[PDB]
Amino acid sequence: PINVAIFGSTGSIGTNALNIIRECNKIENVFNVKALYVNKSVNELYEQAREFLPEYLCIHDKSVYEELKELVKNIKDYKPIILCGDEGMKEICSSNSIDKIVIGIDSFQGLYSTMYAIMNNKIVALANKESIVSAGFFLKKLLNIHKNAKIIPVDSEHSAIFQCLDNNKVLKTKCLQDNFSKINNINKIFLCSSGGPFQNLTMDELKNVTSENALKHPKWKMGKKITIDSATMMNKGLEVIETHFLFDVDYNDIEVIVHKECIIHSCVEFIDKSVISQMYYPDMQIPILYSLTWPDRIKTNLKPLDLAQVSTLTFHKPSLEHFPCIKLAYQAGIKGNFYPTVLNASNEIANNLFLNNKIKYFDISSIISQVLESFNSQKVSENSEDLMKQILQIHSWAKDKATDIYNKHN
Amino acid sequence: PINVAIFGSTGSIGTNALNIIRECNKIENVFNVKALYVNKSVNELYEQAREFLPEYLCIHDKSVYEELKELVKNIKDYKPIILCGDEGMKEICSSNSIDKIVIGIDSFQGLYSTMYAIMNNKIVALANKESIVSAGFFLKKLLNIHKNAKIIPVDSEHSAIFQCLDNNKVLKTKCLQDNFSKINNINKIFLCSSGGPFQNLTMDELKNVTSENALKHPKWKMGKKITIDSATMMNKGLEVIETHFLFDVDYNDIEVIVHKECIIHSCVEFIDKSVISQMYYPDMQIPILYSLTWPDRIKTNLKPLDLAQVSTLTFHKPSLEHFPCIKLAYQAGIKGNFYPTVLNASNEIANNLFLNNKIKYFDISSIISQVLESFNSQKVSENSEDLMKQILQIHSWAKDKATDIYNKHN
Numbered sequence A, B: 001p002i003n004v005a006i007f008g009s010t011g012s013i014g015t016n017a018l019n020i021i022r023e024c025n026k027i028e029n030v031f032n033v034k035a036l037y038v039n040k041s042v043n044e045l046y047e048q049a050r051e052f053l054p055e056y057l058c059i060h061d062k063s064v065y066e067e068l069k070e071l072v073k074n075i076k077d078y079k080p081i082i083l084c085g086d087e088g089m090k091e092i093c094s095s096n097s098i099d100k101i102v103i104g105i106d107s108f109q110g111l112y113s114t115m116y117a118i119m120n121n122k123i124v125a126l127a128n129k130e131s132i133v134s135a136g137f138f139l140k141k142l143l144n145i146h147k148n149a150k151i152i153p154v155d156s157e158h159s160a161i162f163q164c165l166d167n168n169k170v171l172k173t174k175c176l177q178d179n180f181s182k183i184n185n186i187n188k189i190f191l192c193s194s195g196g197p198f199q200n201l202t203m204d205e206l207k208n209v210t211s212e213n214a215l216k217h218p219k220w221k222m223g224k225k226i227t228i229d230s231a232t233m234m235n236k237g238l239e240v241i242e243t244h245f246l247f248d249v250d251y252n253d254i255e256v257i258v259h260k261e262c263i264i265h266s267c268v269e270f271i272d273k274s275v276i277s278q279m280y281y282p283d284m285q286i287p288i289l290y291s292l293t294w295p296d297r298i299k300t301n302l303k304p305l306d307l308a309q310v311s312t313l314t315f316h317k318p319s320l321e322h323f324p325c326i327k328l329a330y331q332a333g334i335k336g337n338f339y340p341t342v343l344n345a346s347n348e349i350a351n352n353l354f355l356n357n358k359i360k361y362f363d364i365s366s367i368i369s370q371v372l373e374s375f376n377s378q379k380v381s382e383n384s385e386d387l388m389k390q391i392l393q394i395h396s397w398a399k400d401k402a403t404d405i406y407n408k409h410n
């Protein structure tokens, strides 16, 4: 019986996490939701609290901690440990009652809970990709110290890849570890992309796209930031780096392929040239579930895949001219050092600027290129505590520099 | 270092088997070809003998045993054990020097060597599907006695399925064993089909197709019998039953899907509804290699898959009206008992009759239906020796009855 915490429960991933847990529990109860944790949204956390009755509840924002303790008074015969800020986060990671922790907090901020989840030797079902991009070697170093901790990828493409693996080999190693690809006989990765809503546009049309065109008609509603990254393909850019770290695959062995129906979620070519891929409808229910039940699988009543209903599956290379964020991500990843940190930090700004209609589409890649060009490699700190500080200083600097380039231009 | 015998070496599978062995050995020598075995074709066996220098050589046909011993005299410093008939076959299966045996003999006749390979506790890389159709429960019974013997499927779709499996689970069991699908969390199988050359024909055009239209433009040259079965889709019919036996999957959980580009070789849906599939270009080099290196994989220099070059992959249900052999195969398999034996035996005849332009296309299914309709279930023999005899008597009877229906109609 699997004890699970959901970090970022009110968001897209968190909501989807509880949905599949709920649905699986109907068939046979095997999950216990032990904790939930959010930033600002008090009401919805309360609603989730009544449904799942988690032993722990927590909220980052101090100033709604009163406004919440209050609301949880209405549940009868229910006394939860109710906590606040990073301190609550740390306490939940400490609990000897929680086995597995889902990381559905967005952006750079997801790194802190991921960091502590590892420190506490937990299974970490990680959807937050920014943490891996900004801090992969830090996470590697940290996973090396804490032998029993594990990152199980929830990002759908990375879930797919992980599912294509013979667990006979995976079990001899773990994600984000040198030699993962050699132990798993991995030769190369096809990293599938939906292509986003802007895929068939001319350069001219592209120049003019807006924040609004990007958010429109979600297959399922994702957080605003990933949705924008999907649209610039910076999301695939980030996922390239994430692949390199998770599975120790060289950048030259990672191929981005646009596959608009999103049925094949990614493919692994093995050293004999046999390719294995994972398929399902565009959905996060399966990656989340698998990360919670690995190395096993359990029954669900999800809609079965129907290949004849899908009928056609297509594959084409992305245009680097239309989607330059991809190139930038490869450049940054191949240079290594802290360039991924800079890539990620400057995108966060340019993503928000475009989101709030502050900048045009090609200004996104323009900002990110200028910031990367302005960065200079630093000696990688030796101990974990110093490395973290260094990551933080570089992250804030790249953010400031991005804001700065925008300011110095209107 | 892997010691391999190739049964049916001069045929399509046997030739392809040695090709991949040769090519893999160039990269790093890991295979030793220990034996080769054929029916009638003396010259080519000799040629293979000079290339591979196998410790044993054998030929079924007694009357070319002289004509061969003669030819092998020309190789210098090379003294092979040269054998004949079933007796040679048995001796090779006995050898303590041979680990793994590839079964590339066609038709019902492949059952004998498969039978003895199992009896001798060998790894059996089995491409011959007819043996599984005619004798699955006999093979199951036999694999139960001989714990260390294993059928590793070489049939590409079955190879694909086997490759989609977590070897962590496979290793707890083996192919052709009750509960295989439960231990592997298998819910259902998409069994892919090329569809054959007749796929877009109208009923009228279909009625008129010839033996010649069927053999035309092989992607790679296959034996005449499988090629014809491919064309009627009786080949997929047989593979449905083969799937049921190999992986203990219910017939209602096996779906035939026409996928003309033949890149996805088959898919496995697991109990959580996640689907895994294996992909490559239409080729037998990979299934053969995998069956020889399982549970491991090794390097090859095969042409890598290029999804953007493939571009489109399509899936549609087959027409039972155009391809009634498929229905007949499901009917026979679901009835069980010895109906698969009858299905297989009567097809062999109707396949040959069509091949030699003796009958029309729909006469194939007509003959096979009449034979099945005429059969009556028998109590399944209790001991292995009696079961075998019973399989043999039913096989010959269905053949005679098929010939007979044809005779009584011109």
Ligand SMILES: NC(=O)C1=CN([C@@H]2O[C@H](COP(=O)(O)OP(=O)(O)OC[C@H]3O[C@@H](n4cnc5c(N)ncnc54)[C@H](OP(=O)(O)O)[C@@H]3O)[C@@H](O)[C@H]2O)C=CC1
Pocket: A007, A008, A009, A010, A011, A012, A013, A014, A037, A038, A039, A040, A041, A042, A060, A103, A104, A105, A106, A107, A109, A110, A127, A128, A129, A130, A154, A155, A156, A221, A222, A223, A224, A226, A284
């Ligand atoms: N959405 C998706 O299908 C996918 C998402 N991902 C990744 O997963 C992560 C989650 O993204 P997504 O769910 O889309 O984003 P959302 O905006 O939908 O959700 C963010 C969640 O994190 C919470 N959060 C923000 N800050 C904190 C904090 N400091 N402490 C605790 N919780 C916090 C939010 O809380 P609050 O509600 O209180 O504001 C909310 O619950 C991202 O990194 C994304 O890249 C990866 C693949 C697919």
Ligand SMILES: NC(=O)C1=CN([C@@H]2O[C@H](COP(=O)(O)OP(=O)(O)OC[C@H]3O[C@@H](n4cnc5c(N)ncnc54)[C@H](OP(=O)(O)O)[C@@H]3O)[C@@H](O)[C@H]2O)C=CC1
Pocket: B007, B008, B009, B010, B011, B012, B013, B014, B037, B038, B039, B040, B041, B042, B060, B103, B104, B105, B106, B107, B109, B110, B127, B128, B129, B130, B154, B155, B156, B221, B222, B223, B224, B226, B284
């Ligand atoms: N061809 C393919 O790509 C595929 C084949 N298969 C299966 O594999 C099996 C082999 O088919 P395929 O290679 O096409 O057929 P072929 O006709 O090309 O080859 C048959 C081989 O078996 C040999 N043979 C026949 N009788 C005997 C015997 N009594 N003793 C020893 N050898 C014998 C033949 O010898 P000889 O040359 O002397 O006549 C020849 O070497 C079939 O059951 C088929 O269904 C499955 C999937 C794909």
Ligand SMILES: COc1ccc([C@H](OCC(=O)N(C)O)P(=O)(O)O)cc1
Pocket: A155, A156, A157, A192, A193, A194, A195, A196, A219, A220, A226, A229, A230, A231, A233, A235, A236, A262, A282
């Ligand atoms: C319509 O369905 C999809 C839309 C977008 C995406 C991808 O973004 C979200 C993501 O990383 N997932 C699901 O792992 P993509 O980066 O391929 O556009 C994947 C599927």
Ligand SMILES: COc1ccc([C@H](OCC(=O)N(C)O)P(=O)(O)O)cc1
Pocket: B155, B156, B157, B192, B193, B194, B195, B196, B219, B220, B226, B229, B230, B231, B233, B235, B236, B262, B282
């Ligand atoms: C053009 O490539 C192909 C032609 C035919 C087939 C199949 O027949 C041969 C076979 O069983 N294999 C390869 O496992 P199918 O039964 O799908 O027509 C598979 C691929």
Ligand SMILES: [Mg+2]
Pocket: A155, A156, A157, A158, A239
């Ligand atoms: Mg993703």
Ligand SMILES: [Mg+2]
Pocket: B155, B156, B157, B158, B239
């Ligand atoms: Mg086949």
